[PDB]
Design an enzyme around this catalytic site. Structure first.
Site, PDB file in Angstrom:
ATOM      1  NE  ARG A 135      16.273  42.750  67.789  1.00  0.00           N
ATOM      2  CZ  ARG A 135      16.230  43.760  66.695  1.00  0.00           C
ATOM      3  NH1 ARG A 135      15.514  43.406  65.735  1.00  0.00           N
ATOM      4  NH2 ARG A 135      17.021  44.707  66.458  1.00  0.00           N
TER       5      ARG A 135
ATOM      6  CD  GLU B  35      17.108  59.662  68.110  1.00  0.00           C
ATOM      7  OE1 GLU B  35      18.413  59.931  68.461  1.00  0.00           O
ATOM      8  OE2 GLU B  35      16.806  58.482  68.173  1.00  0.00           O
TER       9      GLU B  35
ATOM     10  CD1 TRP C 124      14.685  57.546  65.771  1.00  0.00           C
ATOM     11  CD2 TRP C 124      13.750  55.441  65.987  1.00  0.00           C
ATOM     12  NE1 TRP C 124      15.212  56.856  66.859  1.00  0.00           N
ATOM     13  CE2 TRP C 124      14.507  56.000  67.247  1.00  0.00           C
ATOM     14  CE3 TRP C 124      13.099  54.197  66.352  1.00  0.00           C
ATOM     15  CZ2 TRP C 124      14.677  55.112  68.480  1.00  0.00           C
ATOM     16  CZ3 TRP C 124      13.336  53.460  67.609  1.00  0.00           C
ATOM     17  CH2 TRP C 124      13.941  53.675  68.290  1.00  0.00           C
TER      18      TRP C 124
ATOM     19  CE1 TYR D 185      15.428  54.552  74.737  1.00  0.00           C
ATOM     20  CE2 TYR D 185      14.875  55.233  72.247  1.00  0.00           C
ATOM     21  CZ  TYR D 185      15.651  54.440  73.147  1.00  0.00           C
ATOM     22  OH  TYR D 185      16.585  53.543  72.765  1.00  0.00           O
TER      23      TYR D 185
ATOM     24  NE  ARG E  23      14.818  58.385  97.986  1.00  0.00           N
ATOM     25  CZ  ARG E  23      14.091  58.424  98.846  1.00  0.00           C
ATOM     26  NH1 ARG E  23      13.161  59.393  98.900  1.00  0.00           N
ATOM     27  NH2 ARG E  23      13.840  57.592 100.053  1.00  0.00           N
TER      28      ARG E  23
ATOM     29  CB  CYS F 163      19.332  50.439  73.395  1.00  0.00           C
ATOM     30  SG  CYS F 163      18.499  49.512  72.019  1.00  0.00           S
TER      31      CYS F 163
ATOM     32  NE  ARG G 287      17.396  47.168  75.368  1.00  0.00           N
ATOM     33  CZ  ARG G 287      17.095  46.308  74.251  1.00  0.00           C
ATOM     34  NH1 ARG G 287      17.874  45.360  74.117  1.00  0.00           N
ATOM     35  NH2 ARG G 287      16.443  46.974  73.128  1.00  0.00           N
TER      36      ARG G 287
ATOM     37  CG  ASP H 190      24.916  49.951  65.891  1.00  0.00           C
ATOM     38  OD1 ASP H 190      26.280  49.928  66.022  1.00  0.00           O
ATOM     39  OD2 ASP H 190      24.291  50.194  65.176  1.00  0.00           O
TER      40      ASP H 190
ATOM     41  CE1 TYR I  59      23.665  44.306  64.811  1.00  0.00           C
ATOM     42  CE2 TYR I  59      24.263  46.490  65.513  1.00  0.00           C
ATOM     43  CZ  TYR I  59      23.465  45.250  65.502  1.00  0.00           C
ATOM     44  OH  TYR I  59      22.156  45.202  66.300  1.00  0.00           O
TER      45      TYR I  59
HETATM   46  N1  LIG Z   1      21.044  48.497  64.979  1.00  0.00           N
HETATM   47  C1  LIG Z   1      20.895  49.452  65.395  1.00  0.00           C
HETATM   48  N2  LIG Z   1      19.499  49.797  65.709  1.00  0.00           N
HETATM   49  C2  LIG Z   1      18.905  50.802  66.364  1.00  0.00           C
HETATM   50  C3  LIG Z   1      19.780  51.839  66.800  1.00  0.00           C
HETATM   51  C4  LIG Z   1      21.232  51.597  66.629  1.00  0.00           C
HETATM   52  O1  LIG Z   1      22.107  52.330  67.049  1.00  0.00           O
HETATM   53  N3  LIG Z   1      21.579  50.355  65.932  1.00  0.00           N
HETATM   54  N4  LIG Z   1      19.489  53.188  67.542  1.00  0.00           N
HETATM   55  C5  LIG Z   1      20.249  53.859  68.177  1.00  0.00           C
HETATM   56  O2  LIG Z   1      19.895  55.191  68.411  1.00  0.00           O
HETATM   57  C6  LIG Z   1      17.957  53.546  67.127  1.00  0.00           C
HETATM   58  C7  LIG Z   1      18.146  54.295  65.793  1.00  0.00           C
HETATM   59  N5  LIG Z   1      19.135  55.011  65.750  1.00  0.00           N
HETATM   60  C8  LIG Z   1      19.921  55.376  64.655  1.00  0.00           C
HETATM   61  C9  LIG Z   1      21.291  56.085  64.892  1.00  0.00           C
HETATM   62  C10 LIG Z   1      22.052  56.316  63.924  1.00  0.00           C
HETATM   63  C11 LIG Z   1      21.725  55.855  62.530  1.00  0.00           C
HETATM   64  C12 LIG Z   1      22.663  56.087  61.462  1.00  0.00           C
HETATM   65  O3  LIG Z   1      22.332  55.188  60.403  1.00  0.00           O
HETATM   66  N6  LIG Z   1      23.534  56.932  61.497  1.00  0.00           N
HETATM   67  C13 LIG Z   1      24.335  57.103  60.042  1.00  0.00           C
HETATM   68  C14 LIG Z   1      23.279  57.991  58.931  1.00  0.00           C
HETATM   69  C15 LIG Z   1      23.586  59.387  58.929  1.00  0.00           C
HETATM   70  C16 LIG Z   1      23.116  60.010  57.611  1.00  0.00           C
HETATM   71  O4  LIG Z   1      22.645  59.325  56.634  1.00  0.00           O
HETATM   72  O5  LIG Z   1      22.907  61.443  57.471  1.00  0.00           O
HETATM   73  C17 LIG Z   1      25.903  57.512  60.401  1.00  0.00           C
HETATM   74  O6  LIG Z   1      26.066  58.415  60.882  1.00  0.00           O
HETATM   75  O7  LIG Z   1      26.571  56.866  59.720  1.00  0.00           O
HETATM   76  C18 LIG Z   1      20.657  54.968  62.386  1.00  0.00           C
HETATM   77  C19 LIG Z   1      19.766  54.753  63.423  1.00  0.00           C
HETATM   78  C20 LIG Z   1      17.115  52.437  67.183  1.00  0.00           C
HETATM   79  N7  LIG Z   1      17.491  51.052  66.458  1.00  0.00           N
HETATM   80  O1  LIG Z   2      19.234  54.295  71.732  1.00  0.00           O
HETATM   81  C1  LIG Z   2      19.437  53.139  70.934  1.00  0.00           C
HETATM   82  N1  LIG Z   2      20.705  52.982  70.893  1.00  0.00           N
HETATM   83  C2  LIG Z   2      21.394  51.768  70.317  1.00  0.00           C
HETATM   84  O2  LIG Z   2      22.440  51.548  70.236  1.00  0.00           O
HETATM   85  N2  LIG Z   2      20.397  50.814  69.670  1.00  0.00           N
HETATM   86  C3  LIG Z   2      20.800  49.623  69.262  1.00  0.00           C
HETATM   87  C4  LIG Z   2      21.597  48.752  69.927  1.00  0.00           C
HETATM   88  C5  LIG Z   2      21.526  47.246  69.067  1.00  0.00           C
HETATM   89  O3  LIG Z   2      22.576  47.094  68.210  1.00  0.00           O
HETATM   90  C6  LIG Z   2      19.976  47.392  68.679  1.00  0.00           C
HETATM   91  C7  LIG Z   2      18.855  46.939  69.618  1.00  0.00           C
HETATM   92  O4  LIG Z   2      18.685  45.508  69.227  1.00  0.00           O
HETATM   93  P1  LIG Z   2      18.288  44.547  70.558  1.00  0.00           P
HETATM   94  O5  LIG Z   2      17.146  45.156  71.191  1.00  0.00           O
HETATM   95  O6  LIG Z   2      17.973  43.161  69.839  1.00  0.00           O
HETATM   96  O7  LIG Z   2      19.518  44.895  71.087  1.00  0.00           O
HETATM   97  O8  LIG Z   2      19.777  48.868  68.686  1.00  0.00           O
HETATM   98  C8  LIG Z   2      19.119  51.058  69.912  1.00  0.00           C
HETATM   99  C9  LIG Z   2      18.772  52.189  70.533  1.00  0.00           C
HETATM  100  F1  LIG Z   2      17.307  52.620  70.520  1.00  0.00           F
END
Ligand SMILES: Nc1nc2c(c(=O)[nH]1)N(C=O)[C@@H](CNc1ccc(C(=O)N[C@@H](CCC(=O)O)C(=O)O)cc1)CN2
Ligand SMILES: O=c1[nH]c(=O)n([C@H]2C[C@H](O)[C@@H](COP(=O)(O)O)O2)cc1F
Lengths: 315, 292
Positions: free
Chosen positions: A22, A59, A81, A145, A178, A197, A217, A220, A260
């Protein structure tokens, strides 16, 4: 086991099918996986790379108080976020900055553009933090959530408190098959920033230990799954505490688990480092309910990871 | 593999945790379990014991057509879901209390009687094709997801849920098959089923065949090849008086699965009937009788 998470990452690298997603970034992906973490054997915060427990911690707190507005996360200095709130904003009539279509990729490509972005994102953050009306309009990510956990909306002008209900069921009805919580609300999924997710989870009680399975579902694997693991271990521990139980297992179950393509090198460097001991989680014994914890009440002690491996988040 | 399922029966006898409940039923269970079935290796009808394919296909065709009324099932000799319908009628105003055969005949011949007495409320047919929204609308998950696969195979959102927290506390039979996800790659269609509660000797065979059939039907409808069906379990329990059965099954040697033949001269699976789904080369070990 840490090795379990590492084994998945390796397997995706080694035998993952290439797949468009996506976000147009490109991924390597499997369908169907399960890993188990014994919580008695340490709090599963990854040691092959520093993971910031603060951000995980705040979070989850954000989830637990039903909140869907990122102002709370900003207050506690968590930007994980922002992008999806920033995307909503730029795509609205109220935004008259420089053009931001496809910013996810362009800030990787063009250095000048990343300064343009860095500025606008900054202004967004400050506006959210200080103008209440702005915050109300542009901090809101939809019925994600916290809403489905605390406030699932009913057909007749009310709401179900899903998390609470299930904690109460653990107490009085532990052999219940349940004990489920679902973020997956068909009605709301079009209007959410991203549909959950970590979608559904279920609890199990055996011989005084609480175990939890989460159904994800979409995972990442480099940036996502470290957080999710730690997040659901926390929640299991926090529920244990309340319900007076000991900890069992976290079972993490994935649909599309994916890497990715611009995380391939990171995972490689991650895979060459030597596993260390998971740290110990210590809770504040004075606090009674899951919904009573604040950030200074949850600590991880003895955490000695290898260095941060940075990578770009796919928007 | 079939041997994947047999591993699960064996593990439960070896290390499953015993639990006795408010009803007196004893169970050995485990928590968290994944099986895979590669559907190119053959359709997953257990050979270690006859599994009747007739009822599974009537049930799943019933689910797929939105139906929540037993008329369809009765026309086809599928009694699985009689019981709640006959219970409600025995309590109703027009009964003068052998008798289950007269209710069934009633449901079959008098259209008016059926739109009144063969109706079950909130079940799979309702959950897959008719999720009520607040305003009174309805969401047809299965449909939208079929549409999603056609136009957007790479989507990670290919979800059907049968779990509504508003509906569950008040429903007699809360759904065992809680949600499921499709995934598409290299022209193959795969399906993972998250199932919250699993009856290992009796339920799980039936279950594997239903969801494999669906994977094939959806595949056929969106014009794709089948891939794997991945079966994930929450609480997976072997009933205390299914143990001897399980042991008997674990002695028998594994035979190749049969091969599912679908009828090519029909475009939509929404006009599929019993005759359009057949199983070739099915050669199972004898039935193992066991109390439900
Ligand atoms: N592509 C993608 N989108 C997503 C998620 C995801 O895991 N991957 N999510 C999944 O929950 C949610 C957002 N969660 C996230 C979890 C970690 C980080 C992240 O960038 N962590 C870094 C930065 C830490 C820092 O800068 O201090 C890292 O640990 O490298 C970003 C979003 C919603 N959308
Ligand atoms: O709790 C989460 N964990 C997670 O890994 N994603 C990631 C998975 C995927 O890489 C992207 C969601 O994109 P799509 O909805 O197209 O799968 O966000 C999102 C969350 F909210």
């Amino acid at each position: 086991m840490e090795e379990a998470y590492l084994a998945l990452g390796k397997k995706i690298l080694e035998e993952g099918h290439f797949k468009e997603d996506r976000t147009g970034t490109g991924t390597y992906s499997l369908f169907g996986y399960q890993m188990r973490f014994d919580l008695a054997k340490g709090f599963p915060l990854l040691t092959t790379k520093r993971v910031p427990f603060g951000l995980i911690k705040s979070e989850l707190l954000w989830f637990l108080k039903g909140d869907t507005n990122i102002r709370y996360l900003l207050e506690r200095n968590n930007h994980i976020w922002d992008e999806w709130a920033f995307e909503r904003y730029v795509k609205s009539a109220d935004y008259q900055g420089p053009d931001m279509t496809d910013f996810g990729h362009r800030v990787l490509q063009d250095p000048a553009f990343a300064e343009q972005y860095k500025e606008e994102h900054q202004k967004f953050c400050d506006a959210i933090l200080n103008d209440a009306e702005f915050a109300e309009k542009y901090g809101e990510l939809g019925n994600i959530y916290g809403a489905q956990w605390r406030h699932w909306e009913t057909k007749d002008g009310s709401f179900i408190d899903q998390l609470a209900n299930v904690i109460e069921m653990i107490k009085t009805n532990p052999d219940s098959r349940r004990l489920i919580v679902s973020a997956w609300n068909p009605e709301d999924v079009p209007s959410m920033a991203l549909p959950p997710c970590h979608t559904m989870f279920q609890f199990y009680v055996n011989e005084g230990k609480l175990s939890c399975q989460l159904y994800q579902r979409s995972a990442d694997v480099f940036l996502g799954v470290p957080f999710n693991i730690a997040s659901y271990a926390l929640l299991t521990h926090l529920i244990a505490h309340e319900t007076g139980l000991e900890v069992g297992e976290f079972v993490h179950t994935l649909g599309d688990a994916h890497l990715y393509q611009n995380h391939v090198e990171q995972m490689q460097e991650q895979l060459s480092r030597e596993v260390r001991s998971f740290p110990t989680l210590v809770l504040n014994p004075d606090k009674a309910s899951v919904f009573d914890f604040d950030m200074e009440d949850i600590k991880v002690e003895g955490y000695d990871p290898h260095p941060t491996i940075k990578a770009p988040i796919a928007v």
